[PDB]
Design a protein around this ligand. Structure first.
Ligand SMILES: O=c1ccn([C@@H]2O[C@H](COP(=O)(O)OP(=O)(O)O)[C@@H](O)[C@H]2O)c(=O)[nH]1
Ligand SMILES: OC[C@H]1O[C@@H](O)[C@H](O)[C@@H](O)[C@H]1O
Ligand SMILES: OC[C@H]1O[C@@H](O)[C@H](O)[C@@H](O)[C@H]1O
Ligand SMILES: [Mn+2]
Length: 293
């Protein structure tokens, strides 16, 4: 049950004036595409605070990637869901390496110890199993929504309740202007992740997705099961869990899509005029050095 909103004074939405004319702000299945200028965060904050919403944020910091946690968490404190209840879940093979970050009121952090796999591919792919294992009791009792992100990142601007919905993905910043045949979906029919050249709405990122706990448990269980079928068939998808996530979101359309505001790489892609804000961005790193002992 939802109580009434209070009286609020804010600018009138004008029907014959779009918020953004330069971008698609709604998918063909009527899911909002979240860009700056499309939402009044005061109305959304009211709606979600009246529900006492709790948001879980999952982040994996395995092996050398524990070095990214200090900046990730300190910037999360400045920018992620401030004013709302937040539960961080840090999955790591090194609990003693998790930095002591000071948190705002109504925010908590739990450290979940997990095993480390040797190959970066497996570390990244096995997040789906691990998230689904933890949905299956812990998340269901503790949070309303789960946001599942890469750790090699920092928040630079607001990331708030505008993203929350039963199921969301995020447009990969390398592909948002690309035609679908250029998307790097898995193209081998022998893989569970296979998408034909004439299918596909968007190219979503493996590094930022989420939803209600029920929908995120569905997605992560389905992706884990599909990866297991591929492993048994001796095939590993071209972009690993990202490829499986794209297949899942093609067949189970998300109820919001985040614009590339929400996962950008300024070093590789700069700051185009269509991005009014860069909210969550890649930390530069050396793949070969950071992924291997
Ligand atoms: O040795 C590793 C490799 C990967 N990851 C986790 O897997 C995510 C995806 O890997 P990565 O960020 O290397 O992929 P990229 O964004 O560089 O393509 C990382 O953010 C970490 O959460 C990890 O913790 N340790
Ligand atoms: O083509 C898909 C790939 O795009 C690259 O830019 C990115 O580094 C990869 O992680 C993967 O998403
Ligand atoms: O190579 C697979 C990786 O691709 C990246 O683009 C994505 O942000 C990571 O989360 C992981 O899915
Ligand atoms: Mn990453």
């Amino acid at each position: 049950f939802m109580v009434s909103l209070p009286r609020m004074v804010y600018p009138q939405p004008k029907v014959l004036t779009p918020c953004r004319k330069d971008v698609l702000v709604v998918t063909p299945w009527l899911a909002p595409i979240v860009w700056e200028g499309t939402f009044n965060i005061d109305i959304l904050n009211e709606q979600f605070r009246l529900q006492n919403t709790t948001i879980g944020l999952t982040v994996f910091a395995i092996k050398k990637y524990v070095a990214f946690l200090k900046l990730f968490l300190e910037t999360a404190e400045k920018h992620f869901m401030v004013g709302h209840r937040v539960h961080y879940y840090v999955f790591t093979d090194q609990p003693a390496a998790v930095p002591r970050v000071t948190l705002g009121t109504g925010r908590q952090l739990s450290v979940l110890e997990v095993r480390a796999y040797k190959r970066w591919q497996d570390v990244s792919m096995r997040r789906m199993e691990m998230i689904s294992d933890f949905c299956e009791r812990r998340f269901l009792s503790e949070v309303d929504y789960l946001v599942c992100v890469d750790v090699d990142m920092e928040f630079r601007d607001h990331v708030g309740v505008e993203i929350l919905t039963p199921l969301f993905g995020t447009l990969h910043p390398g592909f948002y202007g690309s035609s679908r045949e250029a998307f790097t979906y898995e193209r081998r029919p022998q893989s569970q992740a296979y998408i034909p050249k004439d299918e596909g709405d968007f190219y979503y990122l493996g590094g930022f997705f989420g939803g209600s706990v029920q929908e995120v448990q569905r997605l992560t269980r389905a992706c884990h099961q599909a990866m297991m079928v591929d492993q048994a068939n001796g095939i590993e998808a071209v972009w690993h869990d990202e490829s499986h996530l794209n297949k899942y979101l093609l067949r189970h359309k998300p109820t919001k899509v985040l614009s590339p505001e929400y996962l950008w790489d300024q070093q590789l892609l700069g700051w185009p005029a269509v991005l009014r804000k860069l909210r969550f961005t890649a930390v530069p790193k050396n793949h070969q050095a950071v992924r291997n002992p």
